[PDB]
Amino acid sequence: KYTMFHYLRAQEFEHGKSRIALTNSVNEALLNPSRVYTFFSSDYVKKVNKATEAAMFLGWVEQLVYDFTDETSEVSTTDKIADITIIIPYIGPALNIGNMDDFVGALIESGAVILLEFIPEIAIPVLGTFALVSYIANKVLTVQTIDNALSKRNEKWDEVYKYIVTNWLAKVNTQIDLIRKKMKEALENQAEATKAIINYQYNQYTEEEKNNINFNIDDLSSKLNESINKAMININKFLNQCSVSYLMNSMIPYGVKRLEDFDASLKDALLKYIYDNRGTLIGQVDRLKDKVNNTLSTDIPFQLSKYVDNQRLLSTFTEYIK
């Protein structure tokens, strides 16, 4: 029915003489150049649509800015979700994300996946051990032979991580960044549409009446800009949490299962290689055995900081590690 870009158009209007009115019905917003969509509360809708006496005008303005900031800075902190501690509930209603009708519900059941319009390729192919099997095949056993095999194994873990993180960088964050980029738009639209409904009423006030109080829209718009900045802070925090969440719970584990399988196979190989050739050490190979056993028994730690210099992403990842 409605893509993200339609909701974002429901939230626009052409400058005109008419009084424009916010509405919670998306369909209604689109079919009328006067009606504008909002993800704000029905209480907020009512409060702006209602026509306002000249006396109660500045007091009106006060409440809307309070209501704006209340609605915008909304923050749920339900901690039923893994590695997402903050939610911004109005995101879905604003961009048709969690309506793709309970958002926060949607995150709790399905995780951060629900932000992606396009699910990336998650499967990691089987990692074979043929290259190393061939490498040691009729090689006289030495310390360096075993150490090479093990550096190669390290390198493999490094390759799979790089693969996964890059997939994530390219296909996931770009998508999420789009939500961020667009959320800023939706919020800025709502500011422009409220500034419009207000400055409409004020320009129906008689000049002697109007002359009494000065509109000072550069004050208003400005106060609306700071309320948004505060909202983007919540949104960004949230988004980066979701990013690292998806990465660590829904992407990296697939690599790690495969890498573990790889270590395992390599282990068998090398230990057999060492026993088959123990006679080069007059039969005493206990150290070499212990080396491959220790090395391959522990996963190579994943450091997001290899790939990313971002402040937000790395701290979110730091929080992940405990």
Author numbering: 547 to 646, 650 to 871
Q: What do the paper's sentences say?
A:
Botulinum neurotoxins (BoNTs), the most poisonous biological toxins for mammals, are speculated to exploit a similar mechanism to block neurotransmitter release at neuromuscular junctions that results in fatal botulism. A BoNT molecule consists of a light chain (LC) and a heavy chain (HC) that are linked by a disulfide bridge. LC is a zinc-dependent endopeptidase that is delivered into the cytosol where it degrades SNARE proteins to inhibit synaptic vesicle exocytosis. Membrane translocation of LC is mediated by HC, which can be subdivided into a translocation domain (HN) and a receptor-binding domain (HC).
Taking advantage of our new crystal structure, we set out to look for point mutations on tHNA that shift the structural equilibrium of tHNA more towards the neutral pH conformation as opposed to the acidic pH conformation. After extensive search and screening, we found that tHNA carrying a single point mutation of F658E could be crystallized at pH 8.5 and we determined its structure at 3.02 Å. We found that the structure of tHNAF658E is highly similar to the corresponding region in full-length BoNT/A that was crystallized at a neutral pH (root-mean-square deviation of ~0.96 Å). Taken together, the structures of tHNA at pH 5.1 and tHNAF658E at pH 8.5 allow us to directly visualize how the environmental pH regulates the conformation of the BoNT-switch. BoNT/A1F658E has a ~5-fold decreased toxicity, which is likely due to the energetic costs of burying of an acidic residue in a hydrophobic pocket when tHNA transits into the acidic-pH conformation during LC translocation.
